[PDB]
Amino acid sequence: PHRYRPGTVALREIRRYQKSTELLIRKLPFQRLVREIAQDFKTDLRFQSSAVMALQEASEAYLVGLFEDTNLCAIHAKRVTIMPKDIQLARRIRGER
Amino acid sequence: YRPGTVALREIRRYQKSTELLIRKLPFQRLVREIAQDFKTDLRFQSSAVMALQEASEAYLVGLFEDTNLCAIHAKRVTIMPKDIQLARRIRGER
Amino acid sequence: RKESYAIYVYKVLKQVHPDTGISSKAMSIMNSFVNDVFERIAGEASRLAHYNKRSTITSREIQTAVRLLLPGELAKHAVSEGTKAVTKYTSA
Amino acid sequence: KESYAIYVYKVLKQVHPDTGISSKAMSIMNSFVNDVFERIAGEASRLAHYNKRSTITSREIQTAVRLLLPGELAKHAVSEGTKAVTKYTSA
Amino acid sequence: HLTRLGLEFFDQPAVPLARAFLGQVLVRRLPNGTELRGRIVETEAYLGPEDEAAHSRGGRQTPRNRGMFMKPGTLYVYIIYGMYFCMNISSQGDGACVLLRALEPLEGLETMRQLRSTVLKDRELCSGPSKLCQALAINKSFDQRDLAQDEAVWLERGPAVVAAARVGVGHAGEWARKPLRFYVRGSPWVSVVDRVAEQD
Amino acid sequence: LRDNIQGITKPAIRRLARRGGVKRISGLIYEETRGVLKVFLENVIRDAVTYTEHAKRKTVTAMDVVYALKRQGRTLYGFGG
Amino acid sequence: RDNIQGITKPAIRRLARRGGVKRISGLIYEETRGVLKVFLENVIRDAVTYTEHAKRKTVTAMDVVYALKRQGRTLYGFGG
Amino acid sequence: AKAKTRSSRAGLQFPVGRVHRLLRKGNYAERVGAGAPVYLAAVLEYLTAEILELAGNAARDNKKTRIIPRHLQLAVRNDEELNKLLGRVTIAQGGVLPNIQSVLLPK
Amino acid sequence: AKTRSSRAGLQFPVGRVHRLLRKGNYAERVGAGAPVYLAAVLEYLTAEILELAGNAARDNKKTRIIPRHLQLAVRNDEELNKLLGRVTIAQGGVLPNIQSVLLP
DNA sequence: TGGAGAATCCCGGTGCCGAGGCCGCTCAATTGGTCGTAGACAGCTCTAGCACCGCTTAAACGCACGTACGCGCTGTCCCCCGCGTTTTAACCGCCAAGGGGATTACTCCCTAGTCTCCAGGCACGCGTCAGAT
DNA sequence: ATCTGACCGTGCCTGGAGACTAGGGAGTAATCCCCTTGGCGGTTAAAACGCGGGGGACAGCGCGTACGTGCGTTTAAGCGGTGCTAGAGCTGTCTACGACCAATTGAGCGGCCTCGGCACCGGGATTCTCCA
């Protein structure tokens, strides 16, 4: 069979996802996560569907920006893979703690 | 002394200090030189130049803190221009 | 009745690109952009009027707010367009 | 000009009676009070415009304090403000 | 003369001498040849280290305040953070003294009216210690001198008492609000009055 | 409602990372990323619920989330404005 | 007229030693002079805009405080 | 006595009157002048035209006729002045620009 | 003639806060409990800052607080460092914090 | 170097549902006129900014030397990527329903506005006391 | 042992507080309809798991050199003092610009209908990647 070398599928996934605009997290686990976090603040709430979509777009954009900064942190250490150290350093420079 | 011994003494001295580590009159001349390109025949209050000095000192000290953590992240104890560029890009200025 | 900058953005779009339409979500994006730029410029003009002890927002306050917010070439072109509009409004 | 100097001095003398404040630290406290005032009043103004209400009452100030301050500080600030408003209304 | 008090009466503690310090006529013979004949209406007392507002709190041994423990009843004119003066006589103990606050003269109004102006109503002309210190010709040269020498300032015995809280000290401490200052009741020429303390 | 943070799967974080230009991913990214997401949402919707508590409503609207994002310097276009 | 060189090399070393830095490479100095020039250019341009609107010719400290508040770098202690 | 719109007097397409009403009932100042809505309408019209021209060019580059939010994201993030005006915003359904660092591409 | 600062048990001016709310163009109308609430919140915040600053000056054996003590008070407490995060203090310095890899 | 195999591109045809124009009507922008005060304009005061002058003196500077440190190379092994297979459950479609947001009517109490006045609060003075060095 | 930046009296002044009126913005309740939670079920796409193996993370070693440290010269900041005047800051005066009101009228918004741009499908040409 055909056996792609490690990296090529990762690059083609980078092309495919950066070309598209569709939201990557499944909508129903994100909806349950939003409702589970909202259960800790006010019990028996309800959400508009546009509110959960707004939270999903914000969370996806934030995670993509954090993964960009994490990637440049990992390239700064002369590596290719990303570590939790890179996420921690990126969040400390951005101020989020 | 051995290298790195006097440096840690300078760090412990200057972090306990309060006063402005950048020199007042060359900074004032640089402020005049920058503001010359915007409006001709400007004037500056002394409190304005001291305010700019305090803001610039705090900004550079925070930038060098982030530069130091970028340098420690790369298994180094020496900071380099790539560390300044990385910290400034993650902040969002570049 | 919900007010929005829909037909005005249609008119500017047909003026700069006569054979190009637009979608509903892009109306949402451009309407939010116009509202955010309006809030930013108006809040800066409010701060400018409060700083120099004035009670009136004039074209000078919006001019200095546009100079404060927008980056260089965009700010210069915005000031040129605004002063052209104000001179045309006063003269006619 | 008008400053919060004497009131900050009274707050100092209540919390630490054998303690003084320099001139620059008093200026820093004046700037801090004005900055927190502007933040809370701006959030109350935004919450007045969002709910289409033309009055800033204690409810908007309470939720502006709850938005603008971190957790334990926000809880204690809400408690102190509620105590002051209830004592002022009772009197 | 005969109406001059001696050391047998001035050697007293703070509170029992201050209770017997109402209506006394403090007379300074300024060298023009006239006298003021002014009667006191209110005084202040400092018992010692118990009061936090005293200048000798907690056994202070400053080189300026040194003549009070040598002998009781010591003359003491002293500035208040600048050029305004105040009038004080000490007592036996540490930190115990009594300060003179407000006077009412009966004659010589024009001389102190001219000397005050270094618009001129007599109600606010001497309603305070710094006003009478600029009316009785009080300077800094009355510190190392007693009360029974030559022809200088002395006391004369002239012809209800309400204890009032301190005014102008702020709401701080635990000893700045105790009513100990004695002032007359019903007089309409008192600078510091207490309407709530009139009912006892 | 319990243990719904595991619903954000490992391929979901991989999709978000290759959207961000990441070529290789360590195994300890995912849990760490999940924690980051929780610290985001507990900071956002805590504001939005607060906004819902001020209008005396029981429904968290989209415009409330837009206000909560604008309070944090994370302004969102396309969901009202 | 080159007053950016007046920000000396030991001044940059002092600012880094307050920042916790132990070793400094020789190319740090030109980069941080450029950094100070960019930051000071931004704050001075906004302050000069405030002075233009105030119809003054002297830049006050209040204009600098407003300029730094605009960037999100609020300074306490200068009347702010 | 024919009624002429203030936007028609100023040669503008954005509403002078609506901008004036919003400046009044937005609590910005106690008084709002006559030239301020004209100036702000001209500024908003210029910024709308500046985004829409680049978004139309981006939509023409993708062989499409109408502008979607992805084209607006490309137009904003491919112009430096518009990017630094809008540096803290999320264009919904916008995506990200295609960029990979050179150390990840194969040799 | 009782002032509203003493009517609510507050050390900050309720009237001045009310005047700055009216003249600040925040809204068309202002409430009566809103200046009292805002003055109480400001008084609590300055009490917490002054308490931590006086503690920081007492640990340094100084009886008068300077801006260094204010900086230590704000950036040694997590909540005030979160609130005053984007704010620099004139003559405040930085915290004594040395990274672990630099020490031998 | 060719070459097999997978992936992306690209042509034409289908169909759908959403953009785009038409139209009636509400309601908000515009036209005149008043009237009131905010703000432009002139003028004067005096604060503070600027330029310049010697001195001494702390800091910047250039040079010499050496050792810690960056950086390249190299070996190992571990962890992650790719891929196939199996299990899981998102998701689309449809429906019930009931809680909740929106709206309207009607008060009604709280806050704007104004007169009068009086008590806090800002400006002032400098020896010296603790306070800092 | 020695330098040094804040501490209760006084004139006055001016903004806050009590008192009264008005009117309109917010509270309260009944009613209505979108719309959001919950459930059932089939289908199929996506996640989960196991396994092999390539390749990158990481630790170690050696070497060149480049910064740290120290010392002697040098230079120009720092402090103090003098002179000069531009321009901040305030005040008086008058008038032009905007708030406000009422009548009028057209334009923008909701409803609604229609057709064409775009997503999708499918086979074939093109290119990329891995490999002996």
Residue numbers in the entry:
A (entry chain A): 38 to 134
B (entry chain E): 41 to 134
C (entry chain H): 30 to 121
D (entry chain D): 31 to 121
E (entry chain K): 82 to 199, 208 to 248, 255 to 295
F (entry chain B): 22 to 102
G (entry chain F): 23 to 102
H (entry chain G): 12 to 118
Sentences from the paper on this structure:
We subsequently determined the structures of the NCP–53I and AAG–NCP–53AP at resolutions of 2.8 Å and 3.1 Å, respectively. Similar to the AAG–NCP–50AP complex, AAG in AAG–NCP–53AP is flexible, but the nucleosomal DNA including the AP site and the inserted residue Tyr162 are nicely resolved. AAG in AAG–NCP–53AP is angled at ~85° against the plane parallel to the nucleosome disc. Importantly, in the AAG–NCP–53AP, a drastic local DNA distortion was observed, and the maximal distortion is at –53 with an RMSD of 7.4 Å. There is a significant widening of the minor groove in the local region of –53 position compared to the apo NCP–53I, which is also reflected by much larger displacements for both the damaged and undamaged strands: the calculated RMSDs of the DNA backbones from –58 to –48 (–53 ± 5 positions) are 8.1 Å and 3.9 Å for the damaged and undamaged strands, respectively. Intriguingly, in comparison to the local DNA distortions in the AAG–NCP–30AP and AAG–NCP–50AP, an additional translocation of local DNA around –53 was observed. The AP site at –53 in the AAG–NCP–53AP is relocated to –52 in spatial relation to the translational register of NCP–53I. Since base-flipping at –53 on a regular NCP would cause a clash with H2B, this local register shift from –53 to –52 appears to be necessary for AAG to interact with the flipped base. It must be noted that the global translational register is not affected, and this translocation is restricted to the region from the damage site to the near exit end of the nucleosomal DNA. For the DI in occluded positions such as –53 with medium accessibility, where AAG activity is expected to be lower comparing to solvent-facing positions, AAG induces drastic local DNA distortion, including both twisting and translocation of DNA to generate a shift of local DNA register by 1 bp to relieve the nucleosome-imposed spatial hindrance for accessing the damaged site.
The engagement of a DNA glycosylase with a damaged DNA base marks the initiation of base excision repair. Here, we report cryo-electron microscopy structures of nucleosomes bearing a deoxyinosine (DI) in various geometric positions and structures of them in complex with the DNA glycosylase AAG. The apo nucleosome structures show that the presence of a DI alone perturbs nucleosomal DNA globally, leading to a general weakening of the interface between DNA and the histone core and greater flexibility for the exit/entry of the nucleosomal DNA. Mechanistically, local distortion augmentation, translation/rotational register shift and partial opening of the nucleosome are employed by AAG to cope with substrate sites in fully exposed, occluded and completely buried positions, respectively.
